[PDB]
Structure formats: C-alpha cells, structure tokens
Design a protein around this ligand. Sequence first.
Ligand SMILES: CO[C@H]1C[C@@H]2CC[C@@H](C)[C@@](O)(O2)C(=O)C(=O)N2CCCC[C@H]2C(=O)O[C@H]([C@H](C)C[C@@H]2CC[C@@H](O)[C@H](OC)C2)CC(=O)[C@H](C)/C=C(\C)[C@@H](O)[C@@H](OC)C(=O)[C@H](C)C[C@H](C)/C=C/C=C/C=C/1C
Lengths: 110, 93
Amino acid sequence: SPKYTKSVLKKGDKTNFPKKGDVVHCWYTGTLQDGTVFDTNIQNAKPLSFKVGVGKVIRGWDEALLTMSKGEKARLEIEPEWAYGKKGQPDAKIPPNAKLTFEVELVDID
Amino acid sequence: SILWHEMWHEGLEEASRLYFGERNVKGMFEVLEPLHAMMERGPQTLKETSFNQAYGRDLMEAQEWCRKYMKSGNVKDLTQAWDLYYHVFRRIS
Ligand SMILES: CO[C@H]1C[C@@H]2CC[C@@H](C)[C@@](O)(O2)C(=O)C(=O)N2CCCC[C@H]2C(=O)O[C@H]([C@H](C)C[C@@H]2CC[C@@H](O)[C@H](OC)C2)CC(=O)[C@H](C)/C=C(\C)[C@@H](O)[C@@H](OC)C(=O)[C@H](C)C[C@H](C)/C=C/C=C/C=C/1C
C-alpha cells in the first residue's frame, strides 16, 4: 500500500537507515515519463538536506528515505497522490496527476 | 524578533510555505518584500553588519533572480532564486 516503488541501483551500507527526525543529505535527478529532467541538484552544487518524516518533502520521498541505507542510490517511481497530486507544480513544469521518477542518492545522515 | 538572522529564518520558511505549499506567489512576496527593504536600508549594528557581509549579496541576488522569473516564467530563474534563499536559510540554520 505504499504509493511508490523503489529500485536499488547501488547498494548502501545496509546498516545505517534514516529515522524520523534525522537530517539526510541527497543527490537527485527528477524526470517525467518521457525522460524530461525537470530538476537535478547535481552540477556551487551541494546535496539537498532536510529533516525526514515531518513533511519537508513530498510523501514519496519522506517514506522512501526510511528504507534506504547510507550510500544507497535508488530509482523511485512516485504516484501523484504521494507527489504533487491534482494541482501538480506548473511553475516547475510538473503537470496535474503526474507520476514522478527520481534517482536519489543518500549521501549522509546527520 | 529584532535579530536579522531570526527575522530572515522565519520569513524564508514562511515565504516558502506560501509559495510551495499554498501556491501563493503574491503572499510570498508580501513576506519577502519587508525583509529585502530592511536590507536596502542597510545595517545599523555590529551584528546586522556581520549578517549583511555574510548573506547580503546572496539575498539580493535571490531577489534579482526572482524578479527575472516573474517576467520570464523560466524554471531556471525560479530555481536559482530558491537555491540562494535555501542556502542562506541553511547557513543561518
Ligand atoms: C531550488 O530547488 C528547489 C527544489 C525544487 C522545487 C521544484 C521541484 C519540482 C523540485 O525541482 O525541487 C523537485 O525536484 C522536487 O520535486 N523535490 C525536490 C527534492 C525533494 C523532493 C521534492 C520536494 O519535496 O521538493 C519540495 C517541494 C517542492 C515543496 C514541499 C513539499 C512538501 C510539502 O509538505 C511542503 O509544504 C510546505 C512543500 C521542496 C524542498 O525540498 C525544500 C527543500 C523544502 C521546502 C520548500 C519546505 O519543506 C519548506 O517548508 C515551509 C521548508 O521548510 C524549507 C526548508 C524552507 C526553505 C527556506 C526553503 C527552501 C527551498 C528550497 C527549494 C529548492 C531546493
């Protein structure tokens, strides 16, 4: 009943997983169905950091990160209900009811 | 608060809630405008001066990218603006 699927591209250390309230640091690339890259923070560049499990990011990320170990690179396919839903994010070229694909690399856990 | 780091920390977070959460760019600008105006009045204390030295350039450039975005609609401009606001937010914690 999660509304995302995860495919592991590179394994993490299988030991250190983010917990609710931890700050995580990530590299990512986000794509639409046709492979359009709507954003990447991969090159001044530095990892995205946020406190996990408290709604700082879309639900698909908030839930998926708890299942990744440090160093893991994974492909996430997130259903619109756990991303931007009916409204989408027009300014960022995300349409209504869009399934989002992210490659996410978990670099560190504070 | 009258501390610039606290005023900007609260303002950036609220501005981002209004923009990303509420999809409310008008509201976002109403929160940011006073803070940028404060910067344009200039620092008046030791701590305001130190804050301006550290973050003043990044904050003014964020505003410039945002103004560029409001005429271009180009996501590149939007993202450069928020990258700078995010940077300042994280550095002041
Ligand atoms: C320059 O690039 C943008 C990110 C872009 C925006 C557009 C989207 C396509 C995208 O390209 O990211 C993207 O790829 C995406 O969908 N992302 C980013 C990577 C994590 C997954 C997802 C996301 O949730 O973004 C997030 C999504 C867009 C909005 C949030 C979704 C969850 C929802 O509950 C929140 O409601 C509030 C809003 C954006 C973020 O990851 C940033 C870090 C977090 C926030 C803005 C909020 O948590 C905010 O809450 C008030 C904060 O507490 C922050 C820390 C306050 C500071 C001052 C603001 C920093 C702003 C940083 C902005 C950044 C880096």
